[PDB]
Design a protein around this nucleic acid. Structure first.
Ligand SMILES: N[C@@H](Cc1c[nH]c2ccccc12)C(=O)O
Ligand SMILES: [Mg+2]
Ligand SMILES: [Mg+2]
Ligand SMILES: [Mg+2]
Ligand SMILES: [Mg+2]
Ligand SMILES: [Mg+2]
Ligand SMILES: [Mg+2]
Ligand SMILES: [Mg+2]
Ligand SMILES: [Mg+2]
Ligand SMILES: [Mg+2]
Ligand SMILES: [Mg+2]
Ligand SMILES: [Mg+2]
Ligand SMILES: [Mg+2]
Ligand SMILES: [Mg+2]
Ligand SMILES: [Mg+2]
Ligand SMILES: [Mg+2]
Ligand SMILES: [Mg+2]
Ligand SMILES: [Mg+2]
Ligand SMILES: [Mg+2]
Ligand SMILES: [Mg+2]
Ligand SMILES: [Mg+2]
Ligand SMILES: [Mg+2]
Ligand SMILES: [Mg+2]
Ligand SMILES: [Mg+2]
Ligand SMILES: [Mg+2]
Ligand SMILES: [Mg+2]
Ligand SMILES: [Mg+2]
Ligand SMILES: [Mg+2]
Ligand SMILES: [Mg+2]
Ligand SMILES: [Mg+2]
Ligand SMILES: [Mg+2]
Ligand SMILES: [Mg+2]
Ligand SMILES: [Mg+2]
Ligand SMILES: [Mg+2]
Ligand SMILES: [Mg+2]
Ligand SMILES: [Mg+2]
Ligand SMILES: [Mg+2]
Ligand SMILES: [Mg+2]
Ligand SMILES: [Mg+2]
Lengths: 16, 201, 117, 144, 64
RNA sequence: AGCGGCGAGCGAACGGGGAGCAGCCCAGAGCCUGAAUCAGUGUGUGUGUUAGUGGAAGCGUCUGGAAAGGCGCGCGAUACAGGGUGACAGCCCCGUACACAAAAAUGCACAUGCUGUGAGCUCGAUGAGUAGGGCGGGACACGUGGUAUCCUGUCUGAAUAUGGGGGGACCAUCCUCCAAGGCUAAAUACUCCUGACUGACCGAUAGUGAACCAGUACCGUGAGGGAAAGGCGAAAAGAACCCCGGCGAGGGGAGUGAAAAAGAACCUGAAACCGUGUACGUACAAGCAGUGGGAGCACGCUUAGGCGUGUGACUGCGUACCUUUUGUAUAAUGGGUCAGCGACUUAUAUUCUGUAGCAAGGUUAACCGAAUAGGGGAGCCGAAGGGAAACCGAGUCUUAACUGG
């Protein structure tokens, strides 16, 4: 499936 | 022209426009090609992606898998997927105008007379349906690869020549450009000459 | 009529790889890298036919300069003397003489000096 | 003349475009469609008469006229056909039987086109001035 | 299948002898009090389709 | 033609050419005999169907493991369709053309008994909550529009042969048919299944998902999804026996075989990838790794002359390919590599070009024909245009008319 650090929100939305 | 017999050693008159026009290779080729295309059967089919057995489920979700996106298991890219432009049963026959067909036969007959591949005989028959008897008579005439046209359909001659694969026997009305061009010698009876010149006008 | 592509595909790939014989590693093994190398080899070969003509003229100029300076005149004045004495021996032959026959080159230098003087 | 000595005419068998088969063919990669856009998309293009959203010509011009079924069932006849008819008497049913006009044409007219040289009688058809003069010069008769 | 004629285009254009198309002039439907008489008289007769539009007109009428 | 936010699009009929042809009964009484025509049940004659029988004609020699192949010489053919046999067979085998065969069951077309049914003639009758109408919808190519016609959810409602319906709003004249009961073969549509034949159809990533014990293994609670996997050899003659080894796995001899460079992980055996040996290079040397020049070394040499092959010290130049861009070495995109697959096709219609036929003509479609022949000219395009149209016609329209346009 998918990696947890890609599902996470604090590190994915790192540069809004 | 005048055609010289060999069994009777006589002469027979035939039409200028039927047995003496030039060989028009483009028309003759077009009619020969159209005969072959009409001989095509054309029965085949392949399966498109509408027809391969399988489901319409997306193999994996659109984004996040890391794989190149796919939307159907029946895709023509995939192994065991359908053909992209799969062929269907189609009609391969072509139209020939009647005057082009008649011009092609006239040119073919004129070229046969010009290269002296057409032997005119007065009568051509066998007593009994014996292939041995017909083979002996053709070896007497010194012919091997021969198309024999006859004005009336003779059962004995047809049964005799059914088994010789280099010898064919045809009625007057059933001649065709591929057979006339392909067979090495053509043997015309006088009745067949009359019928052919009549139907060609 | 289904067409299978194995024979033709193998032939094209082997043609490229036989051309790429001698290169380092995947450039001589792997077809993609070999194809990218053979094209660059052809481009370099074309450009270096031109550069070969330039480089060899450069080498002949250097050798004529060295031999003329040994005989007591610069290359430019030596060539001016030859073009003024109307001698049409080109630079390839002049460097050849300057290496192998020093007496003939001494005669040529004397002729050029006489033409300038 | 064999099956392997026949060849077509020169210039009659030009081979079709094969789009997308390498650089050297001149049709490789994009295949004659340019770069991107609706016209290079598969199945892309606009319909007939579309002008980008501007009102098309067939909608900014005004309609006119109407259609006449009498004009649909009336035909005109050349003097050459007048000579080609069979029997020497020219009527509506004789023309229909001689295949000059179709079966549903009721009114006919003879016009000055071609030439007549055979004396024929025209009955029951409107005849123009030039056609009347030509028929009467050739030696015919015009009924009413 | 047969090509289908654009029916509005068929109602608005008729073909002429040498292959051109004739059409009726626009701007003669209303606001005719403030239009001038010279302009209306010159808009009255039928006209010909130009070179910039013959391609579109033929593409809309395959059976004319 | 028409319908159409008169848009996108939808799209007839009249009439013409063919395939196929078939008409009747009740709404009712009388003379008459049960008569035509249909169903079941039997009985005979053909034709089949379900098993089958006969079915022609070749030897020698050379290569070869093997002859069907080469060479020479014969024979059959109403049989040279096809398959097999140690390599490609008319004459070795199974077959094929052809001629026959049915105790028993059954299909069809006839003919003939029984049962049920009634024909022929005369007179009479002519399908009522129906046609039509108001309101709401639907079907007709017809989207309520000037809308005919058909169907009916609701509300009404005639005439009834001296009558009624239709002829595209509607009225009058004329024409043509008789609703409110029903039955009817053929031409037509399809193929889960059966037999034969065919293929410019595929040949194990193809063709069915499935050439193989495949809707299997496996996956899901379930509906459901759904694979991979063909080949020794001609014949198993599938390796007796001996040696190393754990009474192994694996191997080497021996043996069979034409071949084990076919040993069951088996025809051929590519590339990536991994090694062993030989020649050359490389441990003071900087970068798309090549290219131009180039010494030395090693090996072949056949004019003893230099050449050829492998390497490449040193050296000038030299920032990959695709894409997308004004512009990429770009630190923008894609790709770990190999092998196989993967993307402008098909049908119908229309315009232009080339070429071929005929030429003021050209050409047929469906269908008949066993017929790629021939018939079929129904039609379509062209030889005449102008006008919105009637209409006129080498002219026409505009206009009262054009010097005109
Ligand atoms: N990283 C933690 C938490 C986690 C689980 N799934 C996730 C999805 C998104 C973000 C975080 C998580 C884990 O592996 O248990
Ligand atoms: Mg497939
Ligand atoms: Mg025909
Ligand atoms: Mg194949
Ligand atoms: Mg290698
Ligand atoms: Mg280009
Ligand atoms: Mg752009
Ligand atoms: Mg692109
Ligand atoms: Mg574009
Ligand atoms: Mg698409
Ligand atoms: Mg006609
Ligand atoms: Mg107005
Ligand atoms: Mg036999
Ligand atoms: Mg032999
Ligand atoms: Mg073999
Ligand atoms: Mg009634
Ligand atoms: Mg009603
Ligand atoms: Mg009404
Ligand atoms: Mg009614
Ligand atoms: Mg009415
Ligand atoms: Mg498969
Ligand atoms: Mg294989
Ligand atoms: Mg389970
Ligand atoms: Mg063992
Ligand atoms: Mg083999
Ligand atoms: Mg192997
Ligand atoms: Mg290998
Ligand atoms: Mg140093
Ligand atoms: Mg060093
Ligand atoms: Mg370094
Ligand atoms: Mg550099
Ligand atoms: Mg650009
Ligand atoms: Mg930019
Ligand atoms: Mg740059
Ligand atoms: Mg980098
Ligand atoms: Mg990059
Ligand atoms: Mg991008
Ligand atoms: Mg990447
Ligand atoms: Mg006209």
């Amino acid at each position: 499936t998918s990696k947890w650090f890609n599902i996470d929100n604090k590190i994915v939305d790192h540069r809004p | 022209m005048e055609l010289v017999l060999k069994d009777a050693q006589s002469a027979l008159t035939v039409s200028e426009t039927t047995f003496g026009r030039d060989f028009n290779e483009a028309l003759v080729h077009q009619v020969v090609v159209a005969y072959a295309a009409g001989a095509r059967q054309g029965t085949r089919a392949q399966k498109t992606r509408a027809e391969v057995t399988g489901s319409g489920k997306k193999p994996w979700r659109q984004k996040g898998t890391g794989r190149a996106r796919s939307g159907s298991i029946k895709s023509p890219i995939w192994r065991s997927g359908g053909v992209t432009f799969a062929a269907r049963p189609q009609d391969h026959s072509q139209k020939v105008n009647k005057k082009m067909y008649r011009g092609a036969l006239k040119s073919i007959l004129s070229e046969l007379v010009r290269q002296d591949r057409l032997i005119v005989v007065e009568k051509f028959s066998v007593e009994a349906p014996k292939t041995k008897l017909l083979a002996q008579k053709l070896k007497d005439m010194a012919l091997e690869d021969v198309l024999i046209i006859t004005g009336e359909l003779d059962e004995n001659l047809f049964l005799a020549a059914r088994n010789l694969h280099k010898v064919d026997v045809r009625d007057a009305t059933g001649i065709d450009p591929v057979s006339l061009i392909a067979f090495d010698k053509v043997v015309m009876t006088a009745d067949a000459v009359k019928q052919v010149e009549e139907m060609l006008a | 009529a289904r067409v299978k592509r194995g024979v033709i595909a193998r032939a094209r790939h082997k043609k490229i790889l036989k051309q790429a014989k001698g290169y380092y590693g995947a450039r001589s093994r792997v077809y993609r890298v070999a194809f990218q190398a053979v094209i660059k080899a052809g481009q370099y070969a074309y450009r270096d036919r031109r550069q070969r003509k330039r480089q060899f003229r450069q080498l002949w100029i250097a050798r004529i300069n060295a031999a003329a300076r040994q005989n007591g005149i610069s290359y430019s004045k030596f060539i001016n003397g030859l073009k003024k004495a109307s001698v049409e021996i080109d630079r390839k032959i002049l460097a050849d003489i300057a290496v192998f026959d020093k007496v003939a080159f001494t005669a040529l230098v004397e002729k050029a000096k006489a033409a300038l003087a | 003349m064999r099956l392997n000595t026949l060849s077509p005419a020169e210039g009659s068998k030009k081979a079709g475009k094969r789009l997308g088969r390498g650089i050297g063919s001149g049709l490789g990669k994009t295949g004659g469609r340019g770069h991107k856009g609706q016209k290079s998309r598969s199945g892309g293009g606009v319909r007939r008469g579309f002008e980008g959203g501007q009102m098309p010509l067939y909608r900014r011009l005004p309609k006119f006229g109407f259609t006449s079924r009498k004009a649909a069932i009336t035909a005109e006849i050349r003097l050459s056909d007048l000579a080609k008819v069979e029997g020497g008497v020219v009527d509506l049913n004789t023309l229909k039987a001689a295949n000059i006009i179709g079966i549903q044409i009721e009114f006919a007219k003879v016009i000055l086109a071609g030439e007549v040289t055979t004396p024929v009688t025209v009955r029951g058809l409107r005849v123009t001035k030039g056609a009347r003069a030509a028929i009467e010069a050739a030696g015919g008769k015009i009924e009413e | 299948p047969k090509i289908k004629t654009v029916r509005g285009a068929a109602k608005r254009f008729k073909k002429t002898g040498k292959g051109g198309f004739k059409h009726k002039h626009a701007n003669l439907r209303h606001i005719l009090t403030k239009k001038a008489t010279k302009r209306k008289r010159h808009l009255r007769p039928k006209a010909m389709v130009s070179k910039g539009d013959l391609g579109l007109v033929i593409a809309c009428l395959p059976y004319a």
